[PDB]
Design an enzyme around this catalytic site. Structure first.
Site, mmCIF file in Angstrom:
data_model
loop_
_atom_site.group_PDB
_atom_site.id
_atom_site.type_symbol
_atom_site.label_atom_id
_atom_site.label_comp_id
_atom_site.label_asym_id
_atom_site.label_seq_id
_atom_site.Cartn_x
_atom_site.Cartn_y
_atom_site.Cartn_z
ATOM 1 C CG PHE A 1 -1.014 -1.211 11.440
ATOM 2 C CD1 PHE A 1 -1.690 -0.685 10.329
ATOM 3 C CD2 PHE A 1 -0.036 -2.174 11.223
ATOM 4 C CE1 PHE A 1 -1.391 -1.094 9.038
ATOM 5 C CE2 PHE A 1 0.271 -2.604 9.924
ATOM 6 C CZ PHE A 1 -0.400 -2.068 8.828
ATOM 7 N NE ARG B 1 4.860 -10.332 3.825
ATOM 8 C CZ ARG B 1 4.440 -10.078 5.062
ATOM 9 N NH1 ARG B 1 3.508 -9.153 5.267
ATOM 10 N NH2 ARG B 1 4.928 -10.730 6.088
ATOM 11 C CG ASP C 1 7.560 -11.772 9.668
ATOM 12 O OD1 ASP C 1 7.600 -11.882 10.926
ATOM 13 O OD2 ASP C 1 6.524 -12.006 8.988
ATOM 14 C CE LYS D 1 4.124 -8.804 16.104
ATOM 15 N NZ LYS D 1 3.725 -10.053 15.382
ATOM 16 C CG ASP E 1 -0.843 -7.992 10.707
ATOM 17 O OD1 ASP E 1 -0.953 -7.937 9.474
ATOM 18 O OD2 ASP E 1 -0.146 -8.855 11.273
ATOM 19 C CG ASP E 2 -1.976 -9.952 15.812
ATOM 20 O OD1 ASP E 2 -1.091 -9.956 14.910
ATOM 21 O OD2 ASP E 2 -1.748 -9.756 17.018
ATOM 22 C CG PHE F 1 15.875 -5.612 6.192
ATOM 23 C CD1 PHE F 1 16.887 -6.560 6.188
ATOM 24 C CD2 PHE F 1 15.638 -4.910 7.372
ATOM 25 C CE1 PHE F 1 17.607 -6.853 7.356
ATOM 26 C CE2 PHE F 1 16.331 -5.205 8.539
ATOM 27 C CZ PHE F 1 17.317 -6.170 8.531
ATOM 28 C CG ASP G 1 6.302 -15.133 11.083
ATOM 29 O OD1 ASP G 1 6.967 -15.467 12.100
ATOM 30 O OD2 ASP G 1 5.834 -13.991 10.935
ATOM 31 C CE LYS H 1 -2.106 -2.748 2.492
ATOM 32 N NZ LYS H 1 -3.045 -3.723 3.127
ATOM 33 C CG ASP I 1 6.581 -12.662 16.592
ATOM 34 O OD1 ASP I 1 7.014 -13.566 15.843
ATOM 35 O OD2 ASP I 1 5.404 -12.267 16.565
HETATM 36 O O1 LIG Z 1 3.513 -11.408 8.548
HETATM 37 P P1 LIG Z 1 2.669 -10.187 8.899
HETATM 38 O O2 LIG Z 1 2.765 -9.308 7.700
HETATM 39 O O3 LIG Z 1 1.280 -10.639 9.297
HETATM 40 C C1 LIG Z 1 3.409 -9.324 10.315
HETATM 41 O O4 LIG Z 1 2.583 -8.225 10.682
HETATM 42 C C2 LIG Z 1 4.776 -8.807 9.919
HETATM 43 C C3 LIG Z 1 5.445 -7.930 10.929
HETATM 44 C C4 LIG Z 1 4.900 -7.177 11.960
HETATM 45 N N1 LIG Z 1 5.958 -6.545 12.632
HETATM 46 C C5 LIG Z 1 7.145 -6.920 12.004
HETATM 47 C C6 LIG Z 1 8.477 -6.583 12.266
HETATM 48 C C7 LIG Z 1 9.476 -7.121 11.440
HETATM 49 C C8 LIG Z 1 9.126 -7.990 10.397
HETATM 50 C C9 LIG Z 1 7.783 -8.307 10.143
HETATM 51 N N2 LIG Z 1 6.826 -7.747 10.952
HETATM 52 P P2 LIG Z 1 3.554 -10.492 11.711
HETATM 53 O O5 LIG Z 1 4.096 -9.802 12.936
HETATM 54 O O6 LIG Z 1 2.181 -11.054 12.034
HETATM 55 O O7 LIG Z 1 4.493 -11.612 11.325
HETATM 56 MG MG LIG Z 2 4.606 -12.748 9.634
HETATM 57 MG MG LIG Z 3 6.261 -12.461 12.378
HETATM 58 MG MG LIG Z 4 0.366 -10.970 10.934
#
Ligand SMILES: O=P(O)(O)C(O)(Cc1cnc2ccccn12)P(=O)(O)O
Ligand SMILES: [Mg+2]
Ligand SMILES: [Mg+2]
Ligand SMILES: [Mg+2]
Ligand SMILES: O=P(O)(O)C(O)(Cc1cnc2ccccn12)P(=O)(O)O
Ligand SMILES: [Mg+2]
Ligand SMILES: [Mg+2]
Ligand SMILES: [Mg+2]
Lengths: 337, 337
Positions: free
Chosen positions: A226, A99, A90, A187, A230-231, A85, A94, A44, A161
């Site tokens: 935010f 993505r 991540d 994070k 996201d969660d 980066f 994860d 975005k 995390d």
């Molecule tokens: O995978 P997303 O996009 O859902 C995710 O939100 C990615 C995210 C949140 N905060 C960070 C910090 C460093 C790298 C990635 N980060 P998440 O924290 O849930 O892994």
């Molecule tokens: Mg993630």
């Molecule tokens: Mg993560």
């Molecule tokens: Mg997430």
């Protein structure tokens, strides 16, 4: 005020890519270009745009020459690269699948764990751009230190995390509100909203300690929301909108949902969660989702979104000044849409 | 002159770890400490020591107060952390088994690909230390930019390393001398010998362009040899001395050995290499090693070591001045032992 500044922000990527891509290291340069094109595009751009928008709003329009504005787009692109980066790494960690509407870079046939070094390169580009465009500016070192410190804080958050979410290792009592708030502060909160606004501050000669602390008070809270959003969207979002498949339940994450679930659950609901959380079987993940729905967590999220919005608004009233409240208002419009 | 400065360099790690480790992020801090203790310890410390040794030799002993010397050890430790960050990631990407006499960090049960973020944290510590100890010094920004640029160059080298060595994908015609020299210049030469000497230069107020270019002329060549040696030792070294199991043949690497093999091989020897290179089967790796021995590559290496030593010596005679030749001589004694 964003919407009518994007395409021009986005248009400038081609120039970012061109300067970073200017004989022995040719193959490496060609791979950097590939990496930049795959991973810094397709989101975005709200974080990079915020630098541009805030820069216009904080700098007297008579300092807003052609070169100043070019530096603003560049520093905004810096923020996008910081994001890129972190996300590349991540997704590996994860175990994510998609993505931004396409397979994760590391899942690409012929990429795999080479993506670790690709991510590092993206980081390095931040500082190459800063030197290239900002080295003669009085805020050069403020910016360097801001990006580095933002990264450190983010990696400390990434550390929490991953600690709190060990593979194969249920332990739900870890998943507390206090714990949750700390994870997401580090994070997400720093590099998402504090970083880009703070960058534009520094570029505007606003370097006061107290003025940065006040901006923080608002921006760290926006960032917390935010990440809560996201969660929620990880389980309840439409992957064709979010652009990514969710992994939180299988990854054993200290998600806001699992925290809210734990606050609400009957001892018997506790056992269903514990039996099914943190595991790769679609069956078990579906069971967790149905418990969350049983508990009306979507309604709880919608209520929290409304209360958090009002809170951030309260904080803007307390803390914006002497900055134009529009700086914070624009951003909040964008995230609480 | 190193040997009688180590234990004191090494002794100071405990203080490095203590300041970097000074409530919500406690678990993350405890993991950083673990990461630092596992990965920044157990090597030879020649790169960090070189900063200390060179600092003593370049700075008038009357500027060599207690605080100046503390900054020297810290910047030396910075160089060790840069190494540690890169090696943690390199072991993942090279699929390595041991390092510094113990299993690779990422192979540790319960670490795995979390080590990606651990590596990033190690990088971040560089700049935290620089701020903590050097922020008021006139060379603060010279150092920051040196570490960042050293990292960029190293990642570009890592990019060429990995490109030229694709898994499953023999193509021996890639493996040329010209190619080899470029890989190792970038992946090793900058951050191994140029970096630590250059750091001590900057700290000594030696910031001339021409003086840095002259130091480079010597140090980039030392670094090339050091990587040629590293490649030879990957196959022919004793793992109880090197502290690591070699992977180059199985990883399909543009090793100096495979380049030298290719220069020498009968068309029939070519086919044996092509049939056996780049594959995980001990049988096939053993066949490559026996071809290398057939070709007397150990003798070729010993001859190259002697000629490279004489070359570096020639270069010290041309390029050391006005720096004390001992700066370069100490280092060369250490690497051509
Ligand atoms: O995978 P997303 O996009 O859902 C995710 O939100 C990615 C995210 C949140 N905060 C960070 C910090 C460093 C790298 C990635 N980060 P998440 O924290 O849930 O892994
Ligand atoms: Mg993630
Ligand atoms: Mg993560
Ligand atoms: Mg997430
Ligand atoms: O694994 P080693 O220790 O044999 C190895 O020498 C490690 C190495 C050399 N140059 C770099 C640059 C960044 C990270 C690691 N680097 P190599 O290049 O052969 O992987
Ligand atoms: Mg390697
Ligand atoms: Mg290696
Ligand atoms: Mg090696």
């Amino acid at each position: 005020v964003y919407a009518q500044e994007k395409q021009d922000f986005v248009q400038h990527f081609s120039q970012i890519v061109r300067v970073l891509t200017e004989p022995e290291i040719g193959d490496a340069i060609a791979r950097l270009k590939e990496v930049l094109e795959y991973n810094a595009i397709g989101g975005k751009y709200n974080r990079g745009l915020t630098v541009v928008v805030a820069f216009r709003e904080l700098v007297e329009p008579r300092k807003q020459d052609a070169d100043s504005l070019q530096r603003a787009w560049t520093v905004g692109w810096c923020v996008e690269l910081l994001q890129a980066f972190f996300l590349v790494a991540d997704d590996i960690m994860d175990s994510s699948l998609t993505r931004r509407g396409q397979i994760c870079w590391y899942q690409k046939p012929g990429v795999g764990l080479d993506a670790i070094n690709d991510a590092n390169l993206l980081e390095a580009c931040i500082y190459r751009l800063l030197k290239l465009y900002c080295r003669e500016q009085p805020y050069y070192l403020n910016l360097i230190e801001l990006f580095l410190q933002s990264s450190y804080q983010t990696e400390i958050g990434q550390t929490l995390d991953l600690l709190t979410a060990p593979q194969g290792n249920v332990d739900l009592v870890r998943f507390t509100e206090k714990r949750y708030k700390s994870i997401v502060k580090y994070k997400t909160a720093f590099y998402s909203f504090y970083l880009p606004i703070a960058a534009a501050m520094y570029m505007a000669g606003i370097d006061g300690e107290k003025e940065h602390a006040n901006a923080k008070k608002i921006l760290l809270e926006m960032g917390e929301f935010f990440q809560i959003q996201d969660d929620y969207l990880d389980l309840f979002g439409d992957p064709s909108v979010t652009g990514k498949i969710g992994t939180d339940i299988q990854d054993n994450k200290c998600s806001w949902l699992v925290v809210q679930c734990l606050q609400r659950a009957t001892p018997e609901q506790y056992q269903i969660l514990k039996e099914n959380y943190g595991q790769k079987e679609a069956e078990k993940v579906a069971r967790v989702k149905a418990l969350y729905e049983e508990l009306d967590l979507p309604a709880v999220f919608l209520q929290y979104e409304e209360d958090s919005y009002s809170h951030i608004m309260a904080l803007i009233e307390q803390y914006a000044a002497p900055l134009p409240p529009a700086v914070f208002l624009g951003l909040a419009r964008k995230i609480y849409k």
